[PDB]
A and B are shown apart, each in its own frame.
Chain A
Amino acid sequence: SSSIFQLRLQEFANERGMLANGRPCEPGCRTFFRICLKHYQATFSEGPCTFGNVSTPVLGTNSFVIRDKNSGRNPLQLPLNFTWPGTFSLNIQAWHTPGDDLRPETSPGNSLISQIIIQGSLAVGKNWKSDEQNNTLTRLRYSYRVVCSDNYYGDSCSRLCKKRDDHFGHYECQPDGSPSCLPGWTGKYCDQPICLSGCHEQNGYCSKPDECNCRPGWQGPLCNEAA
């Protein structure tokens, strides 16, 4: 995967602890989430989660604030098998499980609480796009983004840069994925040594930075003196 869809769940409110069918959660709504990501579609929803899907363990009961956990993770991660199309559909479902929190999705007694559906445009970037969905029973607060995987760069995450300090290159990685040459090197892949200052362009050369070596028939510190 070259890019990742990241979704951060921030706040959920279900103050009366109700299910979608109108029955109250008993004793409380033990809430976990289901995420369905897919391509943009305006027509009534058809078919599977084409961009991927994921489920969470129970994060809270009834109303609760959801906090991040770098390592039940939040933000959630959906790694992508494709270059990011630029548009999407997102479906978030809130569920109640009467069973144990280990893979609540596999539990037989689950009942839906509520769900939302969004669609739109998103560019790859580190900025979080923030959204709220309020209805009379429940509220959901969240934010999302698409960022590159480690060592992928560019507006479509299509360019790979991995830092080198050996024979093939001496560089770091810029935000656009282009190599940033360490001091004394040049060229696209930073594999060209910058020869000593004033070393004759045609008659002198270097294999190491800050050096001047003479081609046949030349002499002096800068290799500019014929024979």
Chain B
Amino acid sequence: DECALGANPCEHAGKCLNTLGSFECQCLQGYTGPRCEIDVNECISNPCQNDATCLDQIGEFQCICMPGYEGVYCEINTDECASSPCLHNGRCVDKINEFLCQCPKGFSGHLCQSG
């Protein structure tokens, strides 16, 4: 009906739908406003933890993690000792984007594997 009168009033490839005696836009995901002219800020809810950075993207957000963190919300501290890296029964200590091996006496090296 009314969508027929002119060039698509809905920005960003939105979908015009006639309503009685006027009209409305069905916007593609990530866009808002009556004529879809506004880029929705998906980072408003502050989903990103541990000093991560939230990138507002089109229809979705992305969290860029500080080094050593992972997961959708950067809510997971990566376990650098999961693979059991330390040799000669050294003690792995999980740190921030790091792992420290504490050697028993007489052993040295990063993985505590020496004379």
Chain A residues at the B interface, C-beta cutoff of 8 Å: 2, 39-40, 43, 46-47, 50, 81-83, 85, 158-162, 164, 166-169, 177, 189
Q: Decide if the interface of chain A is mainly helix, strand, loop or mixed.
A: loop
Q: Which residues of A sit under 8 angstroms from B5, Cβ to Cβ?
A: 167-168
Stretch from B7-15, B71-79, B87-95, B100-108 contacting the other chain: B7-15
Q: How far is the CA of A169 from the CA of B10 in the complex (A)?
A: 12
Residue among A158, A164, A166, A189 making CB contact with B38, cutoff 8 Å: A158
| Candidate in B5, B34, B37, B56 with the most chain A CB atoms within 10 angstroms | B37
A39, B6: Cβ atoms closer than 8 Å: no
- Some 23 contacts from A to B, beta carbons below 8 A apart, are A39-B55, A40-B53, A43-B66, A43-B67, A46-B67, A47-B67, A50-B64, A82-B55, A82-B57, A82-B62, A83-B43, A83-B56, A83-B57, A85-B53, A158-B41, A160-B12, A160-B38, A160-B39, A166-B6, A168-B9, A169-B9, A177-B37, A189-B35
Q: How far is the CA of A160 from the CA of B62 in the complex (A)?
A: 23
Q: Which residues of B sit under 8 angstroms from A164, Cβ to Cβ?
A: 7
* Residues 36-69 (chain B) with a chain A CB within 8 angstroms: 37-39, 41, 43, 53, 55-58, 62, 64, 66-67
A160, B66: Cβ atoms closer than 8 Å: no
- List the B residue with the shortest CB-CB distance to A82: B55
Q: List 5 additional contacts besides A82-B57, A166-B7; criterion CB under 8 Å.
A: A46-B67, A159-B39, A162-B11, A167-B6, A168-B6
Q: How far is the CA of A164 from the CA of B55 in the complex (A)?
A: 32
A168, B7: Cβ atoms closer than 8 Å: yes
Q: How far is the CA of A82 from the CA of B6 in the complex (A)?
A: 31
Q: Which residues of B sit under 8 angstroms from A81, Cβ to Cβ?
A: 57-58
Q: Which residues of B sit under 8 angstroms from A50, Cβ to Cβ?
A: 64
Q: Which residues of A sit under 8 angstroms from B97, Cβ to Cβ?
A: 46
Least distance between B30 CB and chain A CB atoms (Å): 11
Q: Which residues of A sit under 8 angstroms from B35, Cβ to Cβ?
A: 189
Q: Which residues of A sit under 8 angstroms from B55, Cβ to Cβ?
A: 39, 82-83, 85
| Candidate in A43, A167, A168, A177 with the most chain B CB atoms within 10 angstroms | A168
Query: Knowing A39-B53, A83-B56, A168-B6 touch, does A159 contact B67 (C-beta < 8 A)?
Result: no
| 6 interchain residue pairs of minimum CB distance | A167-B6, A83-B56, A158-B39, A168-B9, A160-B37, A82-B55
Residue among A39, A43, A47, A159 making CB contact with B37, cutoff 8 Å: A159
Query: Knowing A83-B39, A83-B41, A85-B53 touch, does A160 contact B7 (C-beta < 8 A)?
Result: no
Q: How far is the CA of A160 from the CA of B58 in the complex (A)?
A: 14
B11, A82: Cβ atoms closer than 8 Å: no
- List the B residue with the shortest CB-CB distance to A151: B11
A159, B38: Cβ atoms closer than 8 Å: yes
Least distance between A165 CB and chain B CB atoms (Å): 10
Q: Which residues of A sit under 8 angstroms from B34, Cβ to Cβ?
A: 189
